[PDB]
Amino acid sequence: WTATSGSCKGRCFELQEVGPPDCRCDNLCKSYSSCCHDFDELCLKTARGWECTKDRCGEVRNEENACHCSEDCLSRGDCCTNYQVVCKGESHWVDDDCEEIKVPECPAGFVRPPLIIFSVDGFRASYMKKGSKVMPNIEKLRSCGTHAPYMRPVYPTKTFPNLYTLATGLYPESHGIVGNSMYDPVFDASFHLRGREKFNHRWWGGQPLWITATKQGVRAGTFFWSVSIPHERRILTILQWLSLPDNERPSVYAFYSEQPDFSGHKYGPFGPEMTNPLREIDKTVGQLMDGLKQLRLHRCVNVIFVGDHGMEDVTCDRTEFLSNYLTNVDDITLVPGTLGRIRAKSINNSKYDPKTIIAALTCKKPDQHFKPYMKQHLPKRLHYANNRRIEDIHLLVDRRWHVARKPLDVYKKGKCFFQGDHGFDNKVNSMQTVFVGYGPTFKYRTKVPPFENIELYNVMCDLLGLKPAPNNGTHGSLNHLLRTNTFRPTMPDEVSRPNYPGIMYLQSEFDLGCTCDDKVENKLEELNKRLHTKGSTKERHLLYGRPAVLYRTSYDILYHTDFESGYSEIFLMPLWTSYTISKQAEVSSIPEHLTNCVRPDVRVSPGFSQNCLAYKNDKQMSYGFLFPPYLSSSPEAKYDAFLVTNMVPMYPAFKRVWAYFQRVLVKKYASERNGVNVISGPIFDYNYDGLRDTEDEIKQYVEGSSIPVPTHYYSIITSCLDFTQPADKCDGPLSVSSFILPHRPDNDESCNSSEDESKWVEELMKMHTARVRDIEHLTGLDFYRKTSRSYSEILTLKTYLHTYESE
Ligand SMILES: *[C@@H]1O[C@H](CO)[C@@H](O[C@@H]2O[C@H](CO)[C@@H](O[C@@H]3O[C@H](CO[C@H]4O[C@H](CO)[C@@H](O)[C@H](O[C@H]5O[C@H](CO)[C@@H](O)[C@H](O)[C@@H]5O[C@H]5O[C@H](CO)[C@@H](O)[C@H](O)[C@@H]5O)[C@@H]4O)[C@@H](O)[C@H](O[C@H]4O[C@H](CO)[C@@H](O)[C@H](O)[C@@H]4O[C@H]4O[C@H](CO)[C@@H](O)[C@H](O)[C@@H]4O)[C@@H]3O)[C@H](O)[C@H]2NC(C)=O)[C@H](O)[C@H]1NC(C)=O
Ligand SMILES: O=C(Cc1ccc(Cl)c(Cl)c1)N1CCc2cccc(Cc3ccc(F)cc3)c2C1
Ligand SMILES: [Ca+2]
Ligand SMILES: [Ca+2]
Ligand SMILES: [Cl-]
Ligand code: NA
Ligand code: NA
Ligand SMILES: [Zn+2]
């Protein structure tokens, strides 16, 4: 019930939301069908439109008008945005030359520069260049302020997940808005774009910026706007709020536009019809900026112009139908479109089997335009699994396509309407969106590299003097956007210090069931090998310091001629293995006599070692090496590579991938990048939370042993950004690429895996590209501890994702 008989007189776009049954006058009252009876009359005035004209200048105030051109309007805070231009000979903001904003130039009683977030739905990154001729206000923001060529959204690349990520700094799995449509099985409730369940606060986790502000004594404008409030009225409302007295005035505001998304769905991302929506958004930006100029706030406010996601060409004819793959299509529920999520139609059907559905959807048609995954097998970079609202079966849909359950869903919802859609993998170029920051706290005429939208919450907090709630940004990684208000983090403290074992065991103390043809024997070279075991080559192979272990554990540093490792006594294998391969390195084979060679490590007890007999008895599991024998510096150094302490468990199907990486790709990268430093290791994430598993979370072991089986293997591949300098003698910034490969017992993910590894392995590895920071979370390790570079620069490097998309 609402008693809509109250009135909005003096309450128009009130900030505090009043409680039912009392009627509302706030910017969401329309959406709840709760506005007072006189809301339209008083709060949504339209009389005489949005612009002063010469005949209205100095008019007698008429309170019916949408905005005012009377002498008193500036003091009332309710002039039309073009008032000073039309009536007082002033210029539009866009026509003024850019002049650096070195310090905030704010009116008296402003405690901090305000922040205005101007969010645009469906604003694809390439619109900034492609539309620049019809967007002069936006172009001025971009050229004069701080901009990125693009900003990466989160997956899925849909509106609600992305706007809520912008507001919280959290991945959708953590904030709980995992799609525009969701089913929560604990609630037994559905969230939809249409309807009222989405108003329930139990959907919305984390702590959005408006709550962070309010809790810390910073007042916030409401970020949401009912669709029927016209944009001109949204801007005039923000500008009116900015004229409030100091104790009442918010410091943070958001504007939201449904364009260009709305038109993009109908016309495609570059339809001729798209020019007009871009012009109109630009006009709205111009209104805001002219408005700020009138209030003398144009060199005081920080303005963020930001999108939620891009837009791709998608039509009804590019739809895959699950009815063409499954016999049982009526026994499933599909969330359809540019991603798929499958669950059982009935939890009473015990014959529902996710394994049989996955298999029926795997590599069945030669040009198949989606790929099925159990959610835990999705690329870790998507961070899309640790939420009960995410169904176990996921379909990654190729760009330009849809998936649906049956054809009747597509033409009974028989011709096609739409030409654009979004939601695809967040690395896809068409899904990228925009970031511009303009104002005293941002840099002047500065281009920054692309970054992820999860990072902005921290920065918005920095812009407002707020302490951020715990989030998925890496605070400091965007300091290069800012003139001032930078956040100066300290490196985390190392929790576990390593042991440095010497030679402590005789060969005959080991009974591991291993063999090696190595009984082959000089004081020149004897001292020399001793020195390698004490760390004499460590400066070449450990270039950025040893990684720090940020949890409590027992581990040993092991040195060798060609590689250094941090060996876990608890997991019986390295946490990390570090080695440098120069441009000139030679690849060699594993010699015949060493094919099955595994050698005890006399620095590490038998009790803390793996054993070969476990691998012999486990018919499913084989082993690989972290430092590859193929890249040994000499025949004698190669023996080190067969130490039991360099062995890790690997499924034969995975060994195909791993061997190709090690034998072919590492050397290829060293040739292309002028040397590389490689750090490789295992990851255990059995509960798919993106975080390092403790020992008691491990679900699988090599049969009959305590050797845990990794869920993934990582590598971090670092070189000099200036590739004229070799990796191991680099004076300046670094360049990195990394991956987190799923450790799977089949290559079902790769439909062409019967072919030579040169036709499918690198494609697999690109799909599983990762940030250094992703590996940090998954391992509890902290990398790049000892470089010449600033810590903020290193944080930016740790958040870099190598995407393998063209321009
Ligand atoms: C990205 O950044 C985020 C934010 O930093 C990281 O997420 C955090 O990760 C922490 C570790 O996983 C986690 O800490 C836990 O907090 C529990 C208390 O949680 C409530 O309170 C917080 C604080 O206000 C709140 O934010 C939480 O909100 C979650 O849940 C509600 C629903 O109730 C949602 O609305 C919201 O969207 C959010 O859901 C997300 O997180 C939860 C996990 O909390 C997931 O289940 C969801 O799927 C979704 O992803 C909560 O309301 C606390 O109780 C936990 O403590 C247990 O574990 C510790 C280990 O130290 C153990 O010592 C304790 O004994 C305890 O165990 C007991 O309970 C167990 C489970 O029932 C049981 O098995 C045991 O036997 C014990 O009885 C834990 O410390 C933190 O909550 C989240 N925060 C958020 C916002 O998500 C995230 O990791 C980052 N991601 C990456 C990849 O880095
Ligand atoms: O206002 C809106 C239309 C809307 C109308 C009615 C209702 Cl009933 C609702 Cl729910 C939403 N939307 C779009 C969806 C959405 C989702 C999450 C968060 C927001 C707020 C937001 C705004 C700017 C920003 F940079 C970040 C977040 C937004 C902003
Ligand atoms: Ca959107
Ligand atoms: Ca985990
Ligand atoms: Cl209403
Ligand atoms: Na085996
Ligand atoms: Na395959
Ligand atoms: Zn859309």
PDB file of all heavy atoms in Angstrom, residues 707-722:
ATOM      1  N   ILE A 707      50.488 -36.889  -2.125  1.00  0.00           N
ATOM      2  CA  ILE A 707      50.916 -35.906  -3.133  1.00  0.00           C
ATOM      3  C   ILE A 707      49.598 -35.284  -3.650  1.00  0.00           C
ATOM      4  O   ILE A 707      48.811 -35.986  -4.296  1.00  0.00           O
ATOM      5  CB  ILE A 707      51.676 -36.552  -4.311  1.00  0.00           C
ATOM      6  CG1 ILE A 707      52.899 -37.338  -3.802  1.00  0.00           C
ATOM      7  CG2 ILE A 707      52.102 -35.460  -5.327  1.00  0.00           C
ATOM      8  CD1 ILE A 707      53.489 -38.236  -4.830  1.00  0.00           C
ATOM      9  N   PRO A 708      49.381 -33.982  -3.383  1.00  0.00           N
ATOM     10  CA  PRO A 708      48.147 -33.346  -3.838  1.00  0.00           C
ATOM     11  C   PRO A 708      48.145 -33.046  -5.321  1.00  0.00           C
ATOM     12  O   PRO A 708      49.191 -32.725  -5.892  1.00  0.00           O
ATOM     13  CB  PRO A 708      48.091 -32.084  -2.992  1.00  0.00           C
ATOM     14  CG  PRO A 708      49.543 -31.718  -2.800  1.00  0.00           C
ATOM     15  CD  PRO A 708      50.228 -33.048  -2.639  1.00  0.00           C
ATOM     16  N   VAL A 709      46.972 -33.091  -5.955  1.00  0.00           N
ATOM     17  CA  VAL A 709      46.934 -32.876  -7.375  1.00  0.00           C
ATOM     18  C   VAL A 709      46.508 -31.426  -7.589  1.00  0.00           C
ATOM     19  O   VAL A 709      45.446 -31.047  -7.141  1.00  0.00           O
ATOM     20  CB  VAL A 709      45.938 -33.817  -8.067  1.00  0.00           C
ATOM     21  CG1 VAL A 709      45.806 -33.472  -9.526  1.00  0.00           C
ATOM     22  CG2 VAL A 709      46.383 -35.263  -7.842  1.00  0.00           C
ATOM     23  N   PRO A 710      47.327 -30.638  -8.324  1.00  0.00           N
ATOM     24  CA  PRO A 710      46.919 -29.264  -8.616  1.00  0.00           C
ATOM     25  C   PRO A 710      45.667 -29.211  -9.471  1.00  0.00           C
ATOM     26  O   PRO A 710      45.468 -30.074 -10.320  1.00  0.00           O
ATOM     27  CB  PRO A 710      48.118 -28.722  -9.407  1.00  0.00           C
ATOM     28  CG  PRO A 710      49.270 -29.477  -8.849  1.00  0.00           C
ATOM     29  CD  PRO A 710      48.698 -30.872  -8.749  1.00  0.00           C
ATOM     30  N   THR A 711      44.874 -28.163  -9.307  1.00  0.00           N
ATOM     31  CA  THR A 711      43.754 -27.886 -10.205  1.00  0.00           C
ATOM     32  C   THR A 711      44.217 -27.114 -11.442  1.00  0.00           C
ATOM     33  O   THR A 711      43.547 -27.136 -12.480  1.00  0.00           O
ATOM     34  CB  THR A 711      42.621 -27.051  -9.514  1.00  0.00           C
ATOM     35  OG1 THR A 711      43.149 -25.871  -8.944  1.00  0.00           O
ATOM     36  CG2 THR A 711      41.935 -27.817  -8.396  1.00  0.00           C
ATOM     37  N   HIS A 712      45.322 -26.391 -11.311  1.00  0.00           N
ATOM     38  CA  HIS A 712      45.839 -25.518 -12.342  1.00  0.00           C
ATOM     39  C   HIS A 712      47.369 -25.440 -12.237  1.00  0.00           C
ATOM     40  O   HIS A 712      47.928 -25.741 -11.181  1.00  0.00           O
ATOM     41  CB  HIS A 712      45.301 -24.120 -12.192  1.00  0.00           C
ATOM     42  CG  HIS A 712      43.819 -24.006 -12.330  1.00  0.00           C
ATOM     43  ND1 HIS A 712      42.950 -24.269 -11.285  1.00  0.00           N
ATOM     44  CD2 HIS A 712      43.050 -23.598 -13.371  1.00  0.00           C
ATOM     45  CE1 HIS A 712      41.706 -24.062 -11.686  1.00  0.00           C
ATOM     46  NE2 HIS A 712      41.738 -23.661 -12.953  1.00  0.00           N
ATOM     47  N   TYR A 713      48.009 -25.032 -13.346  1.00  0.00           N
ATOM     48  CA  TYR A 713      49.422 -24.675 -13.387  1.00  0.00           C
ATOM     49  C   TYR A 713      49.548 -23.287 -13.957  1.00  0.00           C
ATOM     50  O   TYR A 713      48.982 -22.987 -14.983  1.00  0.00           O
ATOM     51  CB  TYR A 713      50.233 -25.680 -14.230  1.00  0.00           C
ATOM     52  CG  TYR A 713      50.471 -26.979 -13.475  1.00  0.00           C
ATOM     53  CD1 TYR A 713      49.676 -28.110 -13.676  1.00  0.00           C
ATOM     54  CD2 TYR A 713      51.459 -27.055 -12.502  1.00  0.00           C
ATOM     55  CE1 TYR A 713      49.877 -29.266 -12.956  1.00  0.00           C
ATOM     56  CE2 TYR A 713      51.665 -28.215 -11.789  1.00  0.00           C
ATOM     57  CZ  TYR A 713      50.876 -29.310 -12.006  1.00  0.00           C
ATOM     58  OH  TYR A 713      51.103 -30.452 -11.253  1.00  0.00           O
ATOM     59  N   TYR A 714      50.374 -22.471 -13.320  1.00  0.00           N
ATOM     60  CA  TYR A 714      50.588 -21.093 -13.749  1.00  0.00           C
ATOM     61  C   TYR A 714      51.970 -20.906 -14.324  1.00  0.00           C
ATOM     62  O   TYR A 714      52.892 -21.644 -13.977  1.00  0.00           O
ATOM     63  CB  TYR A 714      50.365 -20.086 -12.601  1.00  0.00           C
ATOM     64  CG  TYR A 714      51.403 -20.058 -11.498  1.00  0.00           C
ATOM     65  CD1 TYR A 714      52.521 -19.251 -11.622  1.00  0.00           C
ATOM     66  CD2 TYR A 714      51.323 -20.892 -10.381  1.00  0.00           C
ATOM     67  CE1 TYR A 714      53.524 -19.220 -10.629  1.00  0.00           C
ATOM     68  CE2 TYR A 714      52.277 -20.836  -9.376  1.00  0.00           C
ATOM     69  CZ  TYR A 714      53.393 -20.007  -9.508  1.00  0.00           C
ATOM     70  OH  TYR A 714      54.382 -19.964  -8.565  1.00  0.00           O
ATOM     71  N   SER A 715      52.111 -19.861 -15.127  1.00  0.00           N
ATOM     72  CA  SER A 715      53.429 -19.297 -15.413  1.00  0.00           C
ATOM     73  C   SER A 715      53.311 -17.794 -15.563  1.00  0.00           C
ATOM     74  O   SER A 715      52.286 -17.309 -16.086  1.00  0.00           O
ATOM     75  CB  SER A 715      54.080 -19.919 -16.671  1.00  0.00           C
ATOM     76  OG  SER A 715      54.417 -21.284 -16.485  1.00  0.00           O
ATOM     77  N   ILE A 716      54.330 -17.086 -15.073  1.00  0.00           N
ATOM     78  CA  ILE A 716      54.497 -15.659 -15.212  1.00  0.00           C
ATOM     79  C   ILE A 716      55.753 -15.428 -16.027  1.00  0.00           C
ATOM     80  O   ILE A 716      56.862 -15.849 -15.607  1.00  0.00           O
ATOM     81  CB  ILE A 716      54.644 -14.988 -13.855  1.00  0.00           C
ATOM     82  CG1 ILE A 716      53.387 -15.226 -13.016  1.00  0.00           C
ATOM     83  CG2 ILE A 716      54.954 -13.485 -13.987  1.00  0.00           C
ATOM     84  CD1 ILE A 716      53.598 -14.969 -11.550  1.00  0.00           C
ATOM     85  N   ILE A 717      55.619 -14.700 -17.131  1.00  0.00           N
ATOM     86  CA  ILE A 717      56.680 -14.573 -18.109  1.00  0.00           C
ATOM     87  C   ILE A 717      57.008 -13.107 -18.239  1.00  0.00           C
ATOM     88  O   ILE A 717      56.197 -12.312 -18.765  1.00  0.00           O
ATOM     89  CB  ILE A 717      56.264 -15.173 -19.444  1.00  0.00           C
ATOM     90  CG1 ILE A 717      55.781 -16.608 -19.172  1.00  0.00           C
ATOM     91  CG2 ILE A 717      57.444 -15.150 -20.402  1.00  0.00           C
ATOM     92  CD1 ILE A 717      55.295 -17.359 -20.370  1.00  0.00           C
ATOM     93  N   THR A 718      58.160 -12.723 -17.714  1.00  0.00           N
ATOM     94  CA  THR A 718      58.514 -11.296 -17.571  1.00  0.00           C
ATOM     95  C   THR A 718      59.756 -10.979 -18.456  1.00  0.00           C
ATOM     96  O   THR A 718      60.630 -11.823 -18.669  1.00  0.00           O
ATOM     97  CB  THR A 718      58.826 -10.942 -16.131  1.00  0.00           C
ATOM     98  OG1 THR A 718      57.773 -11.398 -15.287  1.00  0.00           O
ATOM     99  CG2 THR A 718      58.954  -9.461 -15.928  1.00  0.00           C
ATOM    100  N   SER A 719      59.729  -9.790 -19.047  1.00  0.00           N
ATOM    101  CA  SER A 719      60.849  -9.304 -19.871  1.00  0.00           C
ATOM    102  C   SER A 719      60.890  -7.763 -19.772  1.00  0.00           C
ATOM    103  O   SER A 719      60.141  -7.157 -18.994  1.00  0.00           O
ATOM    104  CB  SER A 719      60.725  -9.801 -21.312  1.00  0.00           C
ATOM    105  OG  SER A 719      59.569  -9.252 -21.918  1.00  0.00           O
ATOM    106  N   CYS A 720      61.846  -7.160 -20.477  1.00  0.00           N
ATOM    107  CA  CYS A 720      62.002  -5.712 -20.495  1.00  0.00           C
ATOM    108  C   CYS A 720      61.008  -5.104 -21.447  1.00  0.00           C
ATOM    109  O   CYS A 720      60.829  -5.602 -22.595  1.00  0.00           O
ATOM    110  CB  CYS A 720      63.443  -5.358 -20.927  1.00  0.00           C
ATOM    111  SG  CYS A 720      63.910  -3.728 -20.305  1.00  0.00           S
ATOM    112  N   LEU A 721      60.320  -4.047 -21.010  1.00  0.00           N
ATOM    113  CA  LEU A 721      59.329  -3.393 -21.901  1.00  0.00           C
ATOM    114  C   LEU A 721      60.092  -2.826 -23.111  1.00  0.00           C
ATOM    115  O   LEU A 721      59.658  -2.958 -24.254  1.00  0.00           O
ATOM    116  CB  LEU A 721      58.553  -2.286 -21.181  1.00  0.00           C
ATOM    117  CG  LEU A 721      57.473  -1.558 -21.984  1.00  0.00           C
ATOM    118  CD1 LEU A 721      56.344  -2.483 -22.373  1.00  0.00           C
ATOM    119  CD2 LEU A 721      56.942  -0.342 -21.210  1.00  0.00           C
ATOM    120  N   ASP A 722      61.248  -2.245 -22.836  1.00  0.00           N
ATOM    121  CA  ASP A 722      62.187  -1.875 -23.924  1.00  0.00           C
ATOM    122  C   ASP A 722      62.942  -3.136 -24.333  1.00  0.00           C
ATOM    123  O   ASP A 722      63.948  -3.483 -23.724  1.00  0.00           O
ATOM    124  CB  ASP A 722      63.158  -0.809 -23.466  1.00  0.00           C
ATOM    125  CG  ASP A 722      64.224  -0.484 -24.512  1.00  0.00           C
ATOM    126  OD1 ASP A 722      64.147  -0.975 -25.672  1.00  0.00           O
ATOM    127  OD2 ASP A 722      65.170   0.206 -24.092  1.00  0.00           O
TER     128      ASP A 722
END
